[PDB]
Ligand binder design. Structure first.
Ligand SMILES: CN1CCN(C(=O)c2ccc(F)c(F)c2)CC1
Lengths: 154, 38
């Protein structure tokens, strides 16, 4: 099927009509998404099948056809762009300055942007267009707004 | 059954809409991959 680098929608026909359950990144022949989007199930790209290669529920990540290829990291200072792919809507870039998730195991960048659940897996980019992480695993704060970690493979 | 459809190229776009704040939050990550506010 399609192996071209880029951002892709993850769809299902098991519910009413065609429903977008998430988003992913194709890079160097490997498809990258969040674990909660597919639960590690196989995917279809036209007539071709993508089998899971690596997954980790705690990181909430999964790769297909090969190992995780996204290695860029947020520099901790600069603004980044969420390349949001919302259900039924065109791919759209949103620029923001990340905040921080402070954990007992270190600090992680976080983006305070609110999108429908089916937007999970959208890539976060640096100024060179490199994917520094995936959007879609985070918390709801004291207001009701959503804050996502910048989740990158470790 | 799940399938994928191409949605675009991955590129930085000059003059994208600029929004969102930068909150510093103390968080915990459990064995199930869920974040929670401490
Ligand atoms: C022997 N390998 C095969 C599978 N594997 C990955 O796919 C991987 C590589 C880099 C990452 F950052 C990551 F999150 C995951 C790790 C172990």
């Amino acid at each position: 099927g399609e192996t071209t680098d880029g951002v892709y929608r993850v769809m299902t026909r098991r519910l009413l009509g065609s429903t977008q359950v998430g988003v992913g990144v194709m890079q160097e022949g490997v498809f990258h998404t969040m674990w909660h989007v597919t639960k590690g199930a196989a995917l279809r790209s036209g007539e071709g099948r993508l089998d899971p290669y690596w997954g980790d529920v705690k990181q909430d990540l999964v790769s297909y056809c090969g190992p995780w290829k996204l290695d860029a990291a947020w520099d901790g200072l600069s603004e980044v762009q969420l390349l949001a792919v919302p259900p039924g809507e065109r791919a759209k870039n949103i620029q923001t300055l990340p905040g921080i998730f402070k954990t007992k195991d270190g600090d992680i960048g976080a983006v305070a942007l609110d999108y429908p659940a089916g937007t999970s897996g959208s890539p976060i980019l640096d100024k060179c267009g490199r994917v520094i992480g995936l959007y879609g695993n985070g918390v709801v704060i004291k207001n009701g707004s959503y804050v996502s970690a910048i989740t990158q493979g470790k | 059954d799940m399938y994928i459809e191409r949605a675009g190229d991955i590129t930085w776009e000059k003059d994208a809409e600029v929004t969102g704040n930068s909150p510093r939050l103390d968080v915990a990550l459990d064995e199930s991959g869920d974040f929670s506010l401490v």
